Amino acid sequence: EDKGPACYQVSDEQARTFVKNDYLQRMKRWDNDVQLLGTEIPKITWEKIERSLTDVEDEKTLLVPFKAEGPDGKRMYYGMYHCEEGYVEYA
Ligand SMILES: [Cl-]
Ligand SMILES: [Cl-]
Ligand SMILES: [Cl-]
Ligand SMILES: [Cl-]
Ligand SMILES: [Cl-]
Ligand SMILES: [Cl-]
Ligand code: NA
Ligand code: NA
Ligand code: NA
Ligand code: NA
Ligand code: NA
Ligand code: NA
Ligand code: NA
C-alpha cells in the first residue's frame, strides 16, 4: 500500500534530499516562481525541521522549510513531505 517509509524512519538528510530533488524538478514548470527568483535553479538554504514530541510513529508529514534564492528574488518555502505517499506539497 505504501510507496514510501513512515516519517519517523526518515532522517532530516533524507527529507531534504527528497524535497530538494522534488522542488528543483517542479521549479522547471512553475512560471510565477521562476520569474520571481529569476532562475530555474535557485540556491537553497535549509531551516530546522521540527518534529512532534508526541505520537512520533504516527506522524504522516514532515515539514521541511527552506529559502530559495536567485538573482531577482529570495523566498521562503514550506515543503510538506508526505513520506508514506511519495510526494511534497508547498505552502
Ligand atoms: Cl543549510
Ligand atoms: Cl529543512
Ligand atoms: Cl519542521
Ligand atoms: Cl505513520
Ligand atoms: Cl494518521
Ligand atoms: Cl521562516
Ligand atoms: Na499500510
Ligand atoms: Na518516499
Ligand atoms: Na508516516
Ligand atoms: Na542535511
Ligand atoms: Na505557481
Ligand atoms: Na513535521
Ligand atoms: Na493522498
Nearest to 20 by CA among 91, 75, 88: 88
d(CA 49, CA 66): 10
Measured in angstroms, how far is the CA atom of residue 89 from the centroid of ligand 13?
11
Domain count, the chain: 1
Domain range enclosing 42: 1-91
Resolution in A: 2.7
d(CA 67, CA 46): 7
d(CA 12, CA 10): 7
d(CA 57, CA 76): 28
CATH number at residue 37: 3.10.450.300
Tell me how the structure was determined. Answer: X-ray
Residues with beta carbon < 5 A to ion ligand 2?
46-47, 49, 64
Length of the chain: 91
Characterise 29 by phi-psi region: left (phi > 0), alpha (psi -120 to 50), beta (else).
alpha
